[PDB]
Ligand binder design. Structure first.
Ligand code: PA6
Ligand code: PA6
Length: 38
């Protein structure tokens, strides 16, 4: 329930529903529609 979020944040990412301009969607975080944006 936490490891995808942690892996995202440990690899320069932030969990968002929509990535910011210039960010890449590299995986998902935990929780619904929470996307890892780097
Ligand atoms: C508000 C979440 C608090 C943790 C929880 O209830 O566990 C359920 C899921 C488990 O992780 P998933 O990525 O499978 O949703 O956590 C995320 O909502
Ligand atoms: C139906 C579950 C969708 C979760 C997903 O990872 O993929 C779809 C994403 C969901 O994120 P949204 O921000 O669009 O809701 O859509 C991206 O375009």
């Amino acid at each position: 329930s936490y490891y995808s979020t942690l892996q995202c944040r440990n690899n320069h990412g932030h969990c968002r529903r929509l990535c910011f301009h210039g960010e890449q969607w590299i995986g998902n975080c935990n929780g619904r529609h929470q996307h890892c944006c780097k």
